[PDB]
A paper describes a structure:
Here we applied protein engineering technology to target virus-encoded deubiquitinating enzymes of two viruses with significant impact on human health: Middle East respiratory syndrome coronavirus (MERS-CoV) and Crimean-Congo hemorrhagic fever virus (CCHFV). This resulted in the rapid identification of ubiquitin variant (UbV) inhibitors that bound with high affinity and specificity to the viral deubiquitinating enzymes. Strikingly, coronaviral PLpros also act as vDUBs to suppress host antiviral innate immune responses by targeting cellular Ub-conjugated substrates. The CCHFV vDUB domain is located within the large (L) segment of the genome, and has also been explicitly implicated in the evasion of host Ub- and ISG15-dependent innate immune responses.
To reveal the molecular basis for the inhibition of MERS-CoV PLpro by UbVs, crystal structures of the enzyme were determined bound to ME.2 or ME.4. Both UbVs bound in nearly identical orientations as Ub.wt with interface surface areas of ~1000 Å2. Substitutions common to both ME.4 and ME.2 at positions 46, 64 and 70 were found to promote more favorable hydrophobic interactions with the enzyme relative to Ub.wt. In comparison to Ub.wt residue Val70, UbV residue Ile70 extends further into a hydrophobic pocket of PLpro formed by residues Thr1730* and Val1691* (asterisks denote amino acid numbering of MERS-CoV polyprotein). UbV residue Phe46 inserts into a hydrophobic pocket formed by PLpro residues Trp1668*, Glu1670*, Val1680*, Leu1682*, Tyr1690* and Tyr1705*, and forms a cation-π interaction with Arg1715*. These extensive interactions are not formed at the PLpro-Ub.wt interface with the Ub.wt residue Ala46. The UbVs also differ in their C-terminal residues at positions 74, 75 and 77. In ME.4, Asn74 extends into the active site and forms a hydrogen bonding network with Asp1645* and Gly1758*, which mimics hydrogen bonds formed by the same region of MERS-CoV PLpro with Ub.wt residues Arg74, Gly75 and Gly76. A superposition of ME.4 onto the Ub domain of a previously determined SARS-CoV-Ub complex suggests that Phe46 and Ile70 of ME.4 clash with Val188* and Met209* of SARS-CoV PLpro, respectively, and offers a plausible explanation for the specificity of ME.2 and ME.4 toward MERS-COV PLpro. The most potent inhibitors of MERS-CoV PLpro and CCHFV OTU were ME.4 (deubiquitination IC50 = 0.8 nM and deISGlyation IC50 = 1.2 nM) and CC.4 (deubiquitination IC50 = 3.3 nM and deISGlyation IC50 = 11 nM), respectively.
Author numbering:
A (entry chain B): 1 to 7, 11 to 75
B (entry chain A): 1481 to 1802
């Protein structure tokens, strides 16, 4: 399953059972953004670390929006 | 040894177990990380005075304490309990002032983001927390005692004492653990030229929050993304009934004026450059004026040129055949 993360816009190959933290680690691997600094948005909802992509009904070609944690 | 004491050990204040100790080793070596009356005493040698006293245990939990910890706090990381006990002790010196029956957190140790989070939470009707410890601390906070709630919020948010942090991030991380005690619905009409039209319904609290827009005009506008088939999928709000509406965006510089009769009831402001450490301010609209709550410092203005982040609107009644 391919999804898009708008930062630019890049692409990730993921599974529906992957956790948000797992998705964040891949964004760190490809973009160098530490997971705790990432804020991932989808359908106006902030994705929490403990849940999976299935919990938010994230499907193929879904677009996640990335905001950086302020201050920090 | 030389002397023996018995202490009571808890992780929830409800269930206690007896532990026998001596004065030949520290608490940490015999029992583990322990707090006595809010203070870490792990590296002290037990004394006959503390015999019969109660201790809060932050590690070395038994199987039963681990189960009780999961029921009280939910699934947490190995450092959560020790971090929560330490934050609660560090935020003991903070002061929650009350200006004309409005609670506000005094500025201290870069805690201004917590000021905007708490005061925004105090305006949310009918929210209740699904984590029992978070709900108990919430009632305490609504009753005038905010130490537990402040500390729990920082613990769940991975916040550090003394460091500035993101108010909007923490507010939504907190709200992700709450639920609405009334009715709220949000119907999004979606359509793709290949697949067709499908309506998507959001219930409860998540129907009252959106991260990405800051006006109800932008919330109701048509959006475009990629469908599962790979083509242009569109999406638009066609029904909205809520007790209130929280919209959160990046710091967006606008002119807020009371001579235009604004529709929102409160908003948070980020002061400073986004690549630098900014200062949060909470603002409410009363008596046709802007009441700014700058961490225990109240101001009033008619106009304000500020960078809004969160915006709170009253209940929604909306229909649109799109
Ligand atoms: Cl249509
Ligand atoms: Na404590
Ligand atoms: Zn399609």
């Amino acid at each position: 399953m391919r999804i898009f993360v708008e930062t630019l816009t890049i692409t990730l190959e993921v599974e529906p059972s992957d956790t948000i933290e797992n998705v964040k680690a891949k964004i760190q691997d490809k973009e160098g953004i530490p997971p705790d600094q990432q804020r991932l948005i989808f359908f106006g909802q902030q994705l929490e670390d403990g849940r999976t992509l299935s919990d938010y009904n994230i499907v193929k070609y879904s677009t996640l929006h990335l905001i950086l944690r302020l201050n920090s | 040894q030389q002397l023996t004491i018995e202490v009571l050990v808890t992780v929830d204040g409800v269930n206690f177990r007896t532990v026998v100790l001596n004065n030949k080793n520290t608490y940490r070596s015999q029992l583990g990380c322990v707090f006595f009356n809010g203070a870490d005493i792990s590296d002290t040698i037990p004394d006959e005075k503390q015999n019969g006293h109660s201790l809060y245990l932050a590690d070395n939990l038994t199987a039963d304490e681990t189960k009780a910890l999961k029921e009280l706090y939910g699934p947490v990381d190995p450092t959560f309990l020790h971090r929560f006990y330490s934050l609660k002790a560090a935020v003991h010196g903070w002061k929650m002032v009350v200006c004309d029956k409005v609670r506000s957190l005094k500025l201290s140790d870069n805690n201004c983001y917590l000021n905007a989070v708490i005061m925004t939470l105090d305006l949310l009707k009918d929210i209740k927390f699904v984590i029992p410890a978070l709900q108990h601390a919430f009632m305490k906070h609504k009753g005038g005692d905010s130490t537990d709630f402040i500390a729990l919020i920082m613990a769940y948010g991975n916040c550090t004492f003394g460091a500035p942090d993101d108010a909007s991030r923490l507010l939504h991380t907190v709200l992700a653990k709450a639920e609405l005690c009334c009715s709220a619905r949000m119907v999004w009409r979606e359509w793709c030229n290949v697949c067709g039209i499908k309506d998507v319904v959001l219930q409860g609290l998540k129907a009252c929050c959106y991260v990405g827009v800051q006006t109800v005009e932008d919330l109701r506008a048509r959006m475009t993304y990629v469908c599962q088939c790979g083509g242009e999928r569109h999406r638009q709000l066609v029904e909205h009934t809520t007790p209130w509406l929280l919209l959160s965006g990046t710091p967006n510089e606008k002119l807020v004026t009371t001579s235009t009769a604004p529709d929102f009831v409160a908003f948070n402001v980020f002061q400073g450059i986004e690549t630098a450490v900014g200062h949060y301010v909470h603002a409410r609209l009363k008596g046709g004026l802007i009441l700014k709550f700058d961490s225990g410092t109240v101001s009033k203005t008619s106009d304000w040129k500020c960078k809004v982040t969160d915006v709170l609107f009253p209940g929604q009644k909306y229909s649109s055949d799109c």
